[PDB]
Amino acid sequence: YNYYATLLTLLIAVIVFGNVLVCMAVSREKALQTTTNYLIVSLAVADLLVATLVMPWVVYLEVVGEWKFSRIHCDIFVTLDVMMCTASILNLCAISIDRYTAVAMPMLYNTRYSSKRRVTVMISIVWVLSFTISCPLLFGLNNADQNECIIANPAFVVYSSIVSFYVPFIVTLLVYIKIYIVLRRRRKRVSQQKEKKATQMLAIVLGVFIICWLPFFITHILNIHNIPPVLYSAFTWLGYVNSAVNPIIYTTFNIEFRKAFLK
Ligand SMILES: CCN(CC)C(=O)[C@@H]1C=C2c3cccc4[nH]cc(c34)C[C@H]2N(C)C1
Structure with a gap:
């Protein structure tokens, strides 16, 4: 199946692009060099390593x-x-x-x-x-x-x-x-409006983390203590999509990160 190659390659490219932009933004801008942004860089490094090392062999498994x-x-x-x-x-x-x-x-x-x-x-x-x-x-x-x-x-x-x-x-x-x-x-x-904004961000980060990773792990626990395999694969790909969406939700709302991404 060569049909998976295109879609999963664009997902890998999206993850790499977002995390690389987050790393370059934090490195370049002196105002952005803070410790919370270093935790964000650690998350971006984890996502980038997922996209670069792990996912290409997952594409191989789907294709071959x-x-x-x-x-x-x-x-x-x-x-x-x-x-x-x-x-x-x-x-x-x-x-x-x-x-x-x-x-x-x-x-x-x-x-x-x-x-x-x-x-x-x-x-x-x-x-x-x-x-x-x-x-x-x-x-x-x-x-x-x-x-x-x-x-x-x-x-x-x-x-x-x-x-x-x-x-x-x-x-x-x-x-x-x-x-x-x-x-x-x-x-x-x-x-x-900033007070409602803070609530929005907490709801968004929680909702993304619930939706992307919870179905995979709950499916694993239910399986180990039948369900079709295509949704199992999709649930795994959802966990991989978590890495794609994290650099968006954790940086693109913050204004100083927007300035760096524009620059
Ligand atoms: C189809 C077979 N594969 C591919 C190697 C898996 O089941 C992977 C196993 C995982 C897994 C098990 C147990 C604990 C965990 N924490 C974080 C992960 C994890 C990641 C998770 N990935 C996404 C899939």
């Missing part, structure tokens, strides 16, 4: 339908898929925690020396944790056959799905609704 490369190559492919997707999800959770620090710890957030240490620790933790989650697949824990490159371990699927998605998902959800409650509290305590 069978794995005609080495078995160790298949192991690298699956562990890279898990690692980069987990890194993207954990970067989203880190951005949520940073935005919470902005609202509930305004004085500590403003301090440069403490904020640098916080963000360097968060970036290190998310990347190390994604690597440690993905590493057992390198050990031949996956049981793929010679023809096909897939993950056939239900136990690893459940255990990695939990730590990689569910608890960062619950944490991000609780953190964002906490930010919403604090925003409403200060709105009651106290032009005003």
Whole structure:
């Protein structure tokens, strides 16, 4: 099937274009070099690595339908898929925690020396944790056959799905609704279109993260404890589309990012 090549190649190109523009914008503009924007750059790097390393072999699987490369190559492919997707999800959770620090710890957030240490620790933790989650697949824990490159371990699927998605998902959800409650509290305590804008952004980021990743993981848990395969593939491609949409929703609304993208 050569019909998948076009569509999936445009998806890869869209992801690469958006994340590269975010990285170039943050690097070039001195006003944009802040620690929250460095968390955004970490998310963009995760998405760019998804598009560059992981997705091209996923296109190969769709086109050829069978794995005609080495078995160790298949192991690298699956562990890279898990690692980069987990890194993207954990970067989203880190951005949520940073935005919470902005609202509930305004004085500590403003301090440069403490904020640098916080963000360097968060970036290190998310990347190390994604690597440690993905590493057992390198050990031949996956049981793929010679023809096909897939993950056939239900136990690893459940255990990695939990730590990689569910608890960062619950944490991000609780953190964002906490930010919403604090925003409403200060709105009651106290032009005003910015206050509705903040609500819009929280709803948009939550909705994108729910729609793109939740169906895939819930389908995995339901499967491991029948459903057709085409929607399974589409659910995986939705998770990949998360990487396409993240650099839009996390930068294109902010004005300073728009100026850099125009320039
Ligand atoms: C069809 C077979 N493939 C391709 C290698 C998968 O199932 C991939 C397995 C994933 C997976 C399992 C378990 C935990 C996880 N966290 C993050 C991901 C993940 C990414 C996720 N990708 C998108 C698909």
